[PDB]
Enzyme design. Structure first.
Site, PDB file in Angstrom:
ATOM      1  N   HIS A  25       0.847  -1.200   0.000  1.00 36.27           N
ATOM      2  CA  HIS A  25       0.000   0.000   0.000  1.00 36.27           C
ATOM      3  C   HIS A  25       0.864   1.224   0.000  1.00 36.27           C
ATOM      4  O   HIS A  25       1.355   1.660   1.059  1.00 36.27           O
ATOM      5  CB  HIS A  25      -0.888  -0.024   1.239  1.00 36.27           C
ATOM      6  CG  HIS A  25      -1.763  -1.262   1.333  1.00 36.27           C
ATOM      7  ND1 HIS A  25      -1.261  -2.495   1.617  1.00 36.27           N
ATOM      8  CD2 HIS A  25      -3.130  -1.437   1.105  1.00 36.27           C
ATOM      9  CE1 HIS A  25      -2.273  -3.395   1.605  1.00 36.27           C
ATOM     10  NE2 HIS A  25      -3.402  -2.751   1.274  1.00 36.27           N
ATOM     11  N   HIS A 477     -29.511 -14.436  23.840  1.00 40.20           N
ATOM     12  CA  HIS A 477     -28.519 -14.274  24.911  1.00 40.20           C
ATOM     13  C   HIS A 477     -27.799 -15.581  25.214  1.00 40.20           C
ATOM     14  O   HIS A 477     -26.599 -15.590  25.576  1.00 40.20           O
ATOM     15  CB  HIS A 477     -29.180 -13.698  26.174  1.00 40.20           C
ATOM     16  CG  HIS A 477     -29.447 -12.219  26.090  1.00 40.20           C
ATOM     17  ND1 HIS A 477     -29.889 -11.627  24.961  1.00 40.20           N
ATOM     18  CD2 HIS A 477     -29.290 -11.203  27.029  1.00 40.20           C
ATOM     19  CE1 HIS A 477     -30.007 -10.289  25.164  1.00 40.20           C
ATOM     20  NE2 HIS A 477     -29.631 -10.029  26.419  1.00 40.20           N
TER      21      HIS A 477
END
Ligand SMILES: [Cl-]
Lengths: 669, 651
Positions: A25, A477
């Site tokens: 990059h 949950h």
């Protein structure tokens, strides 16, 4: 040797190392070059010769893909990163991986690459510095004073974790945190405006940050002055640096292909001409080195701090000893005994409580013994039970910037940001942090747990409400896959204690070892088990024989392997199985990860090769196949849960003596 | 006298506190705090038909704060949905239609499943996006068939979660002005006063997103909330409305409220003030007639709308899926399965007008776009979006994934969205909830192992394939080549489980297949190369997936030269393979022939197929930053290591 020449130096190394590796990059390191000069050359308080110097500013490259920016800066300023290494960018075993890695490269403070997390790490480091200062400074002698700088781009700002970390940092008035934003109109897909049109200054002011907008990001003088202004702020600061991606490229600056692809040889030659950078790849003239090198200034800065500390040690010998010990991450001198006392204490008490409660009780004991203990919860303190009798809740000062000292943090409903911040607290040094939430919400913070494991740092992550045992809150949950999914992350220790003693063991183990830990606790009460001295010493081995066969049995042998709340079931299964002609050894495996690290002799002792096995855990079954094989059995749960009381669900889902027997007969057939 | 709004609201408070008392479990405070907001939205603005919760043009409602589920149950029960009082009495009891957090598919009128905070809001964004896209696609100048709002109730928890940032930023950039969020601004989260950890200027935050905000509305004044909703409906921007809101205690609350009625008893006039069946039928009737007029002018579009709202594939789907798969087999191409994926996407888009792709800022890397696509974009001048079928979601994996869940729930599109596999850890809970909801969300993941190379260990998945397999009811596919990719995609599109489709960065060799082998690919695990008809060599089975199938095939002749006869089983989806009947599973993996699994991820997973005595060629550490070919040799993905493992297993 001009700042253009200094910035261009970064440009040449970034573009040439990317081309060499034919990977990486180049666009961000070229875009951010001047920001680099501004911060590193004119502001960063650091010593290349000692990157572990306690009072150094902390820098974090949250936009981690632009890693040649950091490697250039480390190299240019005189850290122990020779030019050979930058030449080996992105090659096996080099000190220059594609994304920067803590522990691999000197001066690399954290490991980045997953977007947004570097920023949350940096919040944690700012929190560490602010907390330590409040703790260790005295009106007549300061030893803690440094800033925390973080570079970031549009990617980090879109990620939800930026919101979690920056909101919290704003509420906590962390005014020595200074963020510089690579503000370039670009992300990977192209012009950011089509998916990200935030008024970022306005967003950040809403969090309680100071914002310096519209800085010319290619003007060293302008950025420098913005950092000076930030440095005097009552609030954490965002500096918006308008840059051009791949700025300085002959023809491709501002293009949409310079983010993550080499520039090519042609663009590089033409970039050499346009910049006037006459030197061959990896050749840096000594006057660029003389302008960038920080060894002299660094030496002066650290020698000064040493004198500062020596003067501190004179006035406060005890506190100075504590500071050094804690910065190094060393435990107290009487640790083994105090830790054995915490465990003996639990064993002596023999209570049947929820392991969340056992956990709180262990924390009480740890705290009295570890001033470095820093607890916290993601808005579930009352449920996780992470705070303790003597703890003080960390809060921003009512009137000025900074925080009042405390040792339990209410992180808010920010599980991911809390977890990355913990990684920052850990990396900073000086505290032993942990933080809690519900187990299922490990899904929100997962990559932070992962990154702790990659970095090999002892972050502690507390999870409660670990199964269908939680009852009525129901299947969103109720964890089913979570326990096994965490086991699977390399180098992450997972503990699921059956009782007060396994909890005490798990915590003291976790506090004392190098692996990050997930400590997994139940909502509901679990029966205390009694143990021999030999057994107590083996819990720390992750799996141990809780109950052996008697020599006097002489019926068909089976091994019941169980964890957490299911140890009770395996234990209740023994006599009913005896009355059926099955002799059951009960193995408790509070940590399979710790068990797997044991030697072959010990593992064979606990799980004799050729004796068949049934594993019992209120979680997905496939995991246990590594211990029970194709021929063994598993009592677990392979569906989502239901909303109903805990006792109702445990029956409904076949965690019964009858099922254990049925499975054992099937396995032994 | 007919019911006052106070009595209408107290009816909610009564049901909430009574259901909680009956269950001895749950949270009464939120429903009780939001009761007036409930009255203002549901009784005055919500467009819906209790008698048909599947009416295509209904407003969509989301309770993002899952804790106050009795608010929603009260609202559904009161306005006339098929949710009897016996169910409310059965709050939080096994198999009741009133679970602790609301569940899509269990309870009529429940639009999504919420519980983990922030995701409902992201769901809502995806529903509003769905409505805006359908409208832009289907409405005509002389005949409108799409026009409805998306409402979400929201608490402080939801606003703290990073996912609200991802969802709200996107909604604001996309100018989703028909999305209206009502925020229970009560000063409180579970730990106490929010100011100590949440001191955001939420109004200014939301304006920064491009939202309209109506701050400081009295959360207990129905008329005020009403007017605030009315204003939001005139807004060019999505709107946030900031609403400032055992036995003995219940008995004294009854007195404080003047609610005289026994538990679960609602007086006739409260029922009459809340009932929505009559306005519902009229609204849906009017809509059915606007639809008949649309069908008269646009018959093909009308049939397409209906088919797509039901989520039914085209009537000749079996032929069209077979043509996609056969074209892959005919082409015989060696490409990365990310490229194979793009090729299949291209064939799917040509027969599925409902196909809706996108990526979390990795469009080029993931290869989620196709040549004939149109990018979704905000209107330049007005609110809303121009229609498109490929979405740039920005760097928002979790928000993209929850939005996709909402797009799926809305009806009308077949959406998918891409990111790198490791970044599944960011979006994981949305993958989980799709699987819990049983909705066919498609999550595309590319760059799936050390095969991605240089980006290094923060990107290189190791545990991810196996950790997603663990999630109940989530299908995981990791195809070896273009044919397994075409099968995986066309199977995912056609079936009810959410799917993770897992693709390589690097080129994988095409595998020739007999007809019988081609017919077995959709079974998830199948024999790709069998033992010779009558042999004397010792037998081993190699089980492989993805990029490792090529390694298994390359090992066969080398194994034979070592006196080992290898069957290669390709397992593109172990989850689909486990649903096959016992006879088939025994045919593919015969009892008592030993196995070696090969897969560039954690080894422990395979113990369920290879047993304690079996072998695994895998990786149980993090990766390194180096080219892919260097890493594969470094990490032992080699024929020689396969042979070593097989001999040690056969010993
Ligand atoms: Cl960037």
């Amino acid at each position: 040797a001009s700042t253009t020449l200094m910035a261009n130096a970064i440009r040449a190394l970034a573009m040439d190392a990317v081309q060499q590796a034919n990977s990486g990059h180049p666009g961000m390191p070229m875009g951010m070059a001047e920001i680099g000069v501004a911060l590193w050359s004119r502001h960063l308080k650091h010593n290349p010769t000692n990157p572990h110097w306690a009072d150094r500013d902390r820098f974090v490259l949250s936009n981690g893909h632009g890693s040649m920016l950091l490697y250039s800066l480390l190299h240019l300023t005189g850290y122990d990163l020779p030019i050979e290494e930058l030449k080996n960018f992105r090659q096996l075993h080099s000190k220059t991986p594609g994304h920067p890695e803590y522990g691999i490269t000197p001066g690399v403070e954290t490991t980045t690459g997953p977007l947004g997390q570097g920023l949350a790490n940096a919040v944690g480091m700012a929190l560490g510095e602010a907390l330590l200062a409040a703790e260790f400074n005295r009106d007549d002698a300061k030893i803690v004073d440094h800033h925390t700088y973080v570079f970031l781009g549009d990617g980090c700002l879109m990620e939800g974790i930026s919101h979690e970390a920056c909101s919290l940092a704003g509420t906590l008035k962390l005014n020595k945190l200074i963020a510089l934003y690579d503000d370039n109109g670009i992300s990977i897909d192209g012009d950011v405006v089509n998916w990200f049109h935030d008024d970022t200054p306005k967003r950040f002011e809403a969090y309680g940050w100071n914002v310096i907008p519209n800085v010319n990001g290619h003007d060293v003088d302008a950025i420098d002055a913005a950092i000076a202004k930030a440095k005097r702020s009552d609030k954490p600061s965002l500096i918006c640096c308008k840059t051009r991606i791949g700025n300085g490229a002959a023809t491709k600056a501002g293009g949409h292909d310079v983010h993550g692809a080499p520039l090519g040889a042609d663009e590089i030659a033409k970039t050499r001409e346009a910049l006037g950078w006459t030197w061959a790849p990896f050749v840096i003239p000594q006057e660029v080195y003389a302008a960038w090198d920080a060894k002299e200034a660094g030496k002066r800065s650290e020698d000064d701090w040493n004198a500062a500390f020596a003067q501190y040690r004179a006035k406060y010998p005890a506190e100075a000893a504590e500071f050094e010990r804690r910065m190094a991450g060393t435990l107290p001198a009487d640790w083994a005994a105090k830790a054995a006392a915490i465990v003996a204490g639990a064993n002596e008490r023999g209570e049947t409580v929820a392991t969340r409660k056992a956990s709180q009780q262990t924390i009480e004991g740890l705290a009295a013994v570890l001033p470095e203990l820093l607890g916290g919860s993601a808005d579930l303190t009352g449920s996780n039970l992470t705070n303790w009798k003597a703890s003080k809740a960390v809060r921003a000062n009512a009137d000025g910037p900074g925080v009042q000292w405390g040792n339990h943090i209410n992180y808010g409903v920010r599980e991911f940001g809390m977890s990355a911040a913990i990684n920052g607290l850990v990396l900073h040094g000086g505290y032993k942090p942990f933080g809690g939430t519900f187990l299922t919400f490990s899904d929100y913070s997962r990559n932070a747990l992962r990154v702790a494991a990659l970095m090999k740092v002892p972050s502690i992550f507390v999870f409660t409400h670990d199964s269908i045992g939680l009852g009525e809150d129901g299947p969103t949950h109720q964890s089913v896959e979570h326990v096994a999914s965490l086991r699977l992350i390399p180098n992450l220790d997972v503990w699921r204690p059956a009782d007060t003693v396994e909890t005490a063991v798990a915590w003291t183990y976790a506090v004392a070892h190098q692996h990050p830990s997930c400590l997994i606790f139940s909502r509901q009460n679990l029966a205390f088990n009694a143990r021999t001295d030999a057994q107590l010493a083996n819990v720390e081995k992750g799996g141990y024989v809780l109950r052996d066969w008697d020599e006097e049995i002489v019926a068909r042998k089976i091994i019941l392997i169980a964890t957490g709340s299911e140890v009770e079931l395996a234990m209740k299964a023994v006599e009913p199985l005896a009355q059926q002609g099955i002799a059951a050894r009960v193995v408790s495996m509070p940590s399979s990860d710790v068990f797997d690290r044991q030697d072959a002799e010990y593992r064979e002792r606990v799980l004799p090769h050729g004796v068949r096995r049934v594993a019992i855990e209120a979680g997905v079954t496939d995991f246990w196949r590594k211990y029970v094989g194709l021929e063994g059995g598993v009592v677990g749960i392979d569906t989502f849960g239901e909303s109903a009381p805990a006792g109702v669900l445990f029956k409904h889902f076949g965690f019964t003596v009858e099922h254990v027997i049925e499975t054992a007969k099937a396995v032994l057939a």
